[PDB]
C-alpha cells in the first residue's frame, strides 16, 4: 500500500560524478535488462553565428556516418549487430547522441559513443552527400506546418538574437558549409565541461564511470588559442510575422510571451496554469464536457482542429503561449477565447482548477519519466540546464506549494499587459491585427 | 514483487505487478475487435472504441470526463484486429476512482441514441486522420485482400456505415463479445486483492465465451488503390504461422534477417539484407521492410516497399528475389545470430516501458492464458534454427500471395507477374 509520497521516496536516485577533464557521468539504476546511454552536449543553434548556422545539424547528420577507428558501415554494423538503436536529436540549445541497448552491451555502447563524439571523420564525400540530403530535408520540413510556425515564432520573438536562427539553418549556409567549418564547430562547442554522459536502466554507476575514464578521458575542455565562446542573453521582441498563404487548407497561429529561464522557480506555477488552459484536438473524445473552457468551446463550435499550450524554456528566456490550428473564419474567435482564458487565470483563478492543473502536471511529470530513453534524456537535460537532476519528490513539493494566489501572481507577471509575439501561417486574414491582439492582453474591467 | 496471475471461475484473468511506482496503470483487455464483426455490423468496433466517454449506467459522460481530468488521469482505448484494450493511468492514490470509471465504461454502457448519433461524425474524423499516412490504408487493403473473412474487416468503419451504426448494434456487440471469459484485467502498481475485488464487483455479469468468430480464410487477392501519390506503397505477403507457434518465431527471425527497422538514424540499414539488395539496383529514394503480422488463427508475412512510382517494379522484384535467395539456402549462421539478438533486444525494449509491459501481459493473457517470463521468450527465440528460417522463407516464396498497392501504380507489378 505505497502512497504517492512513499513512491517518490523509493525512486532510484541519480548519482553524478565528474571526470577530471570535466565530463559529468550520471546514472540512474533500475532492474531493467535494457539501458540507454547517451552523451548530451551543450551545443546548439543558439551558440552558432550567422555564417556557421546549421553546422550543428550537419555534424549531427554525419556523426553516425563514420569514424577514424571504424568506417561508415562499421559503426552501423556494430550497433545493429548488438541490437542497439542509435539516435540523435539537435535543438536550439542542446545536442545529444544516445544508444538504446542491452545492459550487457554497455561497454561497447560507451565505446561507440566516445568514438562518435571525439573521433568523427567528417569525410568530404560524405559531407557532399549529407549536404544534398539536408537541402532535401529543408524542402520537406517546409511542408510540416507546425515546425514552420514555431520557427517563425522564434524568428519574430528573438529577432536579432542567435535564438532566432533555426537548427537546420538557411539553405545558403548548408551549401556553403565546408569541412573546416564543421571541424571548427566540433572543436569549439564539443568540450568535456559542456558534455554529460547519462545512462538509465541496468547500469552500474561505478562501471559507467570506469568506462568513461577509459574512453572519454582524452577529450579536453581547453579552447584553442583561448577562444572561449561566451553565452549571450537574448532579447525578447514583441512582434508579428504573418505568412499569408490562402492556398493552405488550415491556418496555424502561434502566440507567445516571454517566459522564465530553465532555473527560474516560476516555471512550475506557469506549467500549472498552462495545464489549466489545457490542450485540445478534434480527435479528443472528451469534447464539450472537457474541463478546459477553451477546449470545451472549441469542441462545441468546432472552432479549431487542434490547440495546444507550450512552455518552451531556454537558459535565460522562454516562449510561453499556445499554438492552435483553425479554419480561416474561426481564427479571431479562438484568439479571443485564448486571451480570455489567459486573463481569467491572471485575474480570477480559482482553487479547484489549480488543483486540476497540479494533478495534471504531476501525472505528466511521472508519466514522461518512464523508460530508459526518457529517463536518460531527463538526466542529461537536467544536468545541462538545472545543473542537477531535480528529484521527483522536489517536483512534487514545488507543485504542492502552488496555490490560486501563486498562479494569479505568476500569470499576472508573465501574461498580463505584456506584448505578445505572434506567428501566423496559411489563410490568416481573419487573424486580428497586432493592436487588437495586444489590447486583448489586458482587461478594462480589471 | 512479481507478476501474479489468477484465472477466476468466471474465466476472467487478473494480473498485478506492484512496481512501487508513482503511477499505476490498469488495463482491461477484451478479445473483441474488427475480426468479430460480421458484414452487417461492420465498423461497430470503431465506434465502440470512440464511445469510451459516453454516458454509462454508473456515471454520466460529464462525470466521467470531469473526474478523469480532475485526478489528471487518462482513459485510452487501444484496438487491434483481435483485441480491444481499455486502460486508465493516474497516480496510485486515485486509482480506485479511475478503476470504477473503467469498469462502468466496459460493463454498463448505455449507448443513448443522441450521444451515439453525435459521435458518429467522429468516425469519419478519425478515419480521415488515420488515413493521412498511406500506410494505414495500404495495410487495410492488404488485410482485406489477404483474407476473405474475419481478419479482412477494417479497423476503421467503412464509409457507407458512418452514420448507420445503431445503438442496438453496439449493445449487441458488447453483450456478445465483452464477456468474462474474453476479458483480462491487468494492473501495474495495484495490489492483486484490490483488482480481484473490483473484478468481482463489476465483471461478474456477462459470463461465458460469447459469440465466436469464424476462422480466417486466406483469399490471395490484390487491391490497387490508384490514389496518385508520388511514392508507391506496395505490400506483398503470404500466409504464415499463428501467434505462439514455433514457425511464428521462425518468421520473426526471418523478418529480422531480411530487415525490419533501421537502428541507426539516417543510416543505410547495412544489416538489413532487403535494403542493400534493393539499394544496389535502385539509386532513387526507396524504402523496404519485412511485414510480420501474427494473429491467433493465422498470420501474414511479406515485404512492404515504398519507392518512386516509376521504380516500384524494380524495388518489389529485388526484395522478392532477396527473399527467394534466403529461401534457396543462402543464409549465414552469423546473420541468423544477429537477427536473434535484434529480436531479443526488441522484445526487451518493448517490455521496458510501462505501456509496453501492460500490453504484453494483456496480449499473453488473452492469447495464451498464462504469462511467460521474458527469459523464456528469449529462450524460444534462441531455439529457432537456421533451417527453420530457410523453411519460413520457402513457405513465403511458395505460398499464394496477396498484394496491396497505393500510388500512381503505373509500373507497379501485379501479383501474377511477381
Amino acid at each position: 500500500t505505497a502512497t504517492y509520497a512513499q513512491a517518490l521516496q523509493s525512486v532510484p536516485e541519480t548519482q553524478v560524478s565528474q571526470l577530471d577533464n570535466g565530463l559529468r557521468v550520471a546514472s540512474e539504476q533500475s532492474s531493467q535488462p535494457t539501458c540507454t546511454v547517451g552523451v548530451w552536449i551543450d551545443a546548439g543553434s543558439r551558440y552558432e553565428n550567422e555564417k556557421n548556422n546549421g553546422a550543428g545539424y550537419f555534424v549531427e547528420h554525419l556523426a553516425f556516418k563514420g569514424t577514424k577507428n571504424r568506417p561508415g558501415s562499421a559503426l552501423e554494423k556494430e550497433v545493429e549487430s548488438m541490437g542497439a538503436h542509435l539516435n540523435a536529436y539537435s535543438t536550439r540549445e542542446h545536442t545529444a547522441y544516445y544508444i538504446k541497448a542491452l545492459s550487457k552491451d554497455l561497454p561497447k555502447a560507451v565505446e561507440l559513443l566516445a568514438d562518435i563524439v571525439q573521433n568523427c571523420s567528417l569525410e568530404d564525400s560524405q559531407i557532399e552527400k549529407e549536404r544534398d540530403v539536408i537541402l532535401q530535408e529543408l524542402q520537406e520540413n517546409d511542408s510540416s506546418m507546425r515546425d514552420v510556425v514555431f520557427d517563425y515564432l522564434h524568428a519574430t520573438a528573438f529577432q536579432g538574437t542567435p535564438l532566432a536562427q533555426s537548427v537546420e539553418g538557411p539553405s545558403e549556409n548548408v551549401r556553403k558549409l565546408s569541412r573546416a567549418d564543421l571541424t571548427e564547430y566540433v572543436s569549439q562547442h564539443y568540450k568535456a565541461p559542456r558534455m554529460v554522459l547519462a545512462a538509465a536502466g541496468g547500469v552500474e554507476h561505478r562501471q559507467l564511470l570506469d568506462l568513461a575514464q577509459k574512453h572519454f578521458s582524452s577529450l579536453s575542455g581547453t579552447y584553442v588559442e583561448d577562444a572561449v565562446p561566451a553565452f549571450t542573453p537574448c532579447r525578447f521582441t514583441g512582434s508579428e510575422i504573418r505568412h499569408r498563404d490562402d492556398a493552405l487548407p488550415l491556418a496555424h497561429v502561434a502566440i507567445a510571451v516571454e517566459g522564465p529561464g530553465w532555473a527560474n522557480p516560476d516555471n512550475v506555477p506557469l506549467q500549472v496554469a498552462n495545464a489549466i488552459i489545457g490542450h485540445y484536438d478534434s480527435t479528443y473524445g472528451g469534447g464539450t464536457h472537457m474541463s478546459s473552457t477553451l477546449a470545451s468551446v472549441a469542441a462545441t463550435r468546432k472552432l479549431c482542429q487542434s490547440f495546444q499550450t507550450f512552455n518552451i524554456c531556454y537558459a535565460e528566456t522562454g516562449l510561453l503561449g499556445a499554438h492552435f490550428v483553425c479554419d480561416n473564419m474561426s481564427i479571431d474567435d479562438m484568439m479571443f477565447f485564448l486571451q480570455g482564458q489567459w486573463m481569467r487565470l491572471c485575474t480570477s483563478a480559482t482553487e479547484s482548477e489549480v488543483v486540476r492543473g497540479k494533478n495534471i502536471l504531476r501525472n505528466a511529470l511521472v508519466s514522461h519519466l518512464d523508460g530508459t530513453t526518457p529517463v536518460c534524456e531527463d538526466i542529461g537535460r537536467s544536468l545541462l540546464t538545472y545543473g542537477r537532476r531535480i528529484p521527483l519528490a522536489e517536483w512534487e513539493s514545488r507543485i504542492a506549494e502552488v496555490d490560486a494566489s501563486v498562479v494569479r501572481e505568476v500569470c499576472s507577471k508573465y501574461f498580463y499587459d505584456q506584448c505578445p509575439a505572434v506567428a501566423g501561417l496559411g489563410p490568416i486574414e481573419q487573424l486580428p491585427d497586432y493592436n487588437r491582439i495586444r489590447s486583448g492582453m489586458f482587461w478594462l474591467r480589471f | 514483487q512479481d507478476l501474479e496471475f489468477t484465472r477466476l471461475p468466471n474465466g476472467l484473468v487478473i494480473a498485478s505487478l506492484e512496481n512501487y511506482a508513482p503511477a499505476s496503470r490498469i488495463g482491461l483487455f477484451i478479445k473483441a475487435g474488427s475480426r468479430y464483426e460480421d458484414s452487417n455490423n461492420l465498423g461497430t468496433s470503431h465506434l465502440l472504441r470512440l464511445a469510451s466517454s459516453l454516458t454509462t449506467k454508473g456515471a454520466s459522460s460529464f462525470k466521467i470526463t470531469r473526474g478523469i481530468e480532475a485526478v489528471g488521469g487518462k482513459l485510452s482505448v487501444t484496438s487491434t484486429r483481435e483485441s480491444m484494450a481499455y486502460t486508465v493511468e493516474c497516480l496510485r492514490d486515485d486509482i480506485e476512482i479511475l478503476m470504477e470509471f473503467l469498469l462502468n465504461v466496459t460493463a454498463a454502457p448505455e449507448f443513448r441514441r443522441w450521444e451515439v448519433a453525435a459521435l458518429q461524425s467522429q468516425l469519419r474524423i478519425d478515419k480521415a486522420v488515420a488515413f493521412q499516412n498511406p500506410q494505414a490504408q495500404v495495410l487495410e487493403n492488404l488485410h482485406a485482400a489477404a483474407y476473405r473473412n474475419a481478419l479482412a474487416n477494417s479497423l476503421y468503419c467503412p464509409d457507407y456505415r458512418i452514420g448507420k451504426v445503431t445503438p442496438d448494434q453496439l449493445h449487441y456487440y458488447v453483450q456478445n463479445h465483452f464477456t468474462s471469459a474474453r476479458m483480462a484485467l491487468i494492473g501495474l502498481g495495484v495490489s492483486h486483492p484490490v483488482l480481484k475485488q473490483v473484478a468481482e464487483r463489476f465483471l461478474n455479469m456477462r459470463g461465458g465465451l460469447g459469440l465466436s468468430g469464424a476462422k480466417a480464410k486466406y483469399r490471395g487477392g490484390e487491391i490497387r488503390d490508384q490514389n496518385g501519390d508520388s511514392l508507391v506503397h506496395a505490400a506483398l505477403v503470404a500466409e504464415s504461422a499463428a501467434t505462439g507457434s514455433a514457425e511464428a518465431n521462425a518468421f520473426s527471425v526471418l523478418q529480422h534477417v531480411l530487415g525490419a527497422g533501421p537502428h541507426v538514424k539516417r543510416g543505410s540499414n547495412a544489416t538489413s539484407s532487403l535494403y542493400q539488395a534493393v539499394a544496389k539496383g535502385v539509386h532513387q529514394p526507396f524504402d523496404v521492410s519485412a511485414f510480420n503480422a501474427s494473429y491467433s488463427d493465422s498470420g501474414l508475412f511479406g515485404i512492404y516497399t515504398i519507392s518512386q512510382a516509376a521504380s516500384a517494379g524494380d524495388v518489389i522484384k529485388s526484395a522478392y528475389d532477396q527473399v527467394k535467395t534466403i529461401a534457396q539456402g543462402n543464409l549465414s549462421n552469423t546473420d541468423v545470430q544477429a537477427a536473434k539478438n535484434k529480436l531479443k533486444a526488441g522484445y526487451l525494449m518493448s517490455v521496458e516501458s510501462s505501456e509496453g509491459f501492460l500490453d504484453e501481459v494483456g496480449s499473453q493473457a488473452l492469447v495464451a492464458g498464462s504469462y511467460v517470463q521474458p527469459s523464456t521468450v528469449l529462450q524460444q527465440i534462441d531455439s529457432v534454427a537456421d533451417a527453420d528460417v530457410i523453411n519460413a522463407a520457402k513457405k513465403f516464396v511458395s505460398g499464394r500471395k496477396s498484394m496491396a498497392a497505393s500510388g500512381n501504380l503505373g509500373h507497379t507489378p501485379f501479383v501474377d507477374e511477381l
Binding site: G278, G286 | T65, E69, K74, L75, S76, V77, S79
Partner: peptide, 29 residues
C-alpha cells in the same frame, strides 16, 4: 514498424494498431 495509427487524446485516446509497415527512411531519402 507497426506504426500504430495513434490519435492524440486526453481522457479518451483512441489508438488502433497495425503490423510492421516500413516508412523508415522516407524522410532520409
Amino acid at each position: 514498424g507497426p506504426f500504430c495509427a495513434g490519435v492524440v487524446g486526453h481522457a479518451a485516446l483512441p489508438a488502433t494498431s497495425e503490423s510492421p509497415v516500413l516508412d523508415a527512411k522516407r524522410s532520409f531519402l
